[PDB]
Structure 1
């Protein structure tokens, strides 16, 4: 299954991330800045079907249970958000996509002077699919990423040709909580 472990924090607050056995990981976090922790693949694919089971999902603040990855050419950070805490992420509304039993809202946002895979202070577009209501957790779940890639394409949101990592993540900003996720 997975071959990659992602564990990044801007150093704000506490992010206690555990690289577990196989595709399993856990995070306990408190009063954070920006962070992203997850398991997945060093090289993303628009054709990948990601499976996971979030045995524990207990955010608050801005904390997302999300497919997370990058492309370059152009530099794009993308999300397929299945669940969240207190605040649901949104941006510029494009449309919707139905996939894996859920309806997701498609949004774009822009990050300025921000950390990325390309450096400490960079500018990049973010693509989002955000589930309309929180996905149930604790059972096996699939994200059929091709559905999202295709839907994004239809709204002129094209991904880059150079694929970086792709993980099923716990990601947050000004957030506290616990997660435990297995990815395959």
Structure 2
């Protein structure tokens, strides 16, 4: 079928756990994607000035897989820090072939990120020809982990009481079942202004802080359930989102790579 890449440039996430230094930090809302020097990636921050101090610090092009970052928040109102591929060039997900992300991070503990929080992969896509106007804009999450809250352990996967919406199905990939959820955001803020749009989630049933995410596998399973992504992928980034609380996220590894079905590398970052 799809051959898992074995290219030696891929960093084993399980043992990629050395603390990084020399971050470059951003303490305010970026106003969208901002390209990173000497990198294929871009970052984005949403730091609501109604709340306390937040930051995202990129570890640079030449260590940690190239997309590693730290983030901090002190009583935010829905802090989002993210870094990874920025696309928005009128292409469907399949144009990018098999997308993978190897990761390894530390984070603050249970109940340090408010009542909801998300760690994993995030983006948007556009599908203007969709018959249902609600489905012409999509926000998406592949949720590897979260901070739990007062009511629920961070070792317990979030459900529809947190995400909203409807369980569509599930599947198993990368060592865990994932619950697939579709939610409609009615007259809510988006990359296209206040409107109605849909959210797609895959929630990892066994939360984790390191491993590899076979991102394209999620996209395929969503589309099979009728959760279509359309023909203009916006981005595919590694995200930390914190509803509130005082906490941190600190990646030793975030490495994106893309491979075709034979498993040959199309894109990867970064003598003895």
Which category describes the TM-score, using the shorter chain as reference length? 0.7 to 0.9
1:149 deviates by 1.1
Could you tell me which of 92, 101, 104 is aligned with 1:50?
Answer: 101
Q: Provide runs of 4+ in structure 1 moved above 6 Å.
A: none
TM-score (norm 2): 0.61
Structure with the bigger RCO (C-alpha within 8 Å, sep 6+) is: 1
Instruction: State the TM-score, normalized to the length of structure 1.
Output: 0.87
What's 2:121 paired with? Answer: 67
CA distance in 1, matches of 2:48, 2:214: 30
More strand, by proportion: 1
Aligned equivalent of 2:254: 183
Larger Rg: 2
Per-residue deviation, 1:80: 0.3
- Aligned pairs, how many? 180
Q: Which residue does 2:182 correspond to in 1?
A: 108
| Deviations 1:52-91, CA, capped at 9 Å, x for gaps | 2213354432121120011012210000000011252523
Structure 1 residues 161 and 175 mapped into 2: Cα distance closer, same or farther (>3 Å)? farther
Map 1:115-134; keep pairs closer than 5 Å: 115-119=189-193, 121-134=194-207
Distance 1:79-1:154 versus aligned 2 partners, 3 A rule: same
Aligned to 1:98: 172
Classify the secondary structure of the residue corresponding to 1:156. Answer: coil
Shift of 1:19: 2.7
* 1:25-40 alignment, distance < 5 Å: 25-40=69-84
- Structure 1 match to 2:234: 164
Query: CA 1:165 to 1:157, structure 2 compared with 1: closer, same or farther past 3 Å?
Result: same
What residue number does 1:78 align with?
Answer: 140
Q: How far did 1:174 drift?
A: 3.0
Change (3 A) 1:57 1:144: farther
8 Å Cα contact 2:79-2:244 kept in structure 1: no
Q: Are the equivalent residues in 1 in contact too, given 2:113–2:243 (CA < 8 A)?
A: no
Task: Indicate if the aligned counterparts of 1:2 and 1:183 stay in contact, CA closer than 8 A.
Answer: no
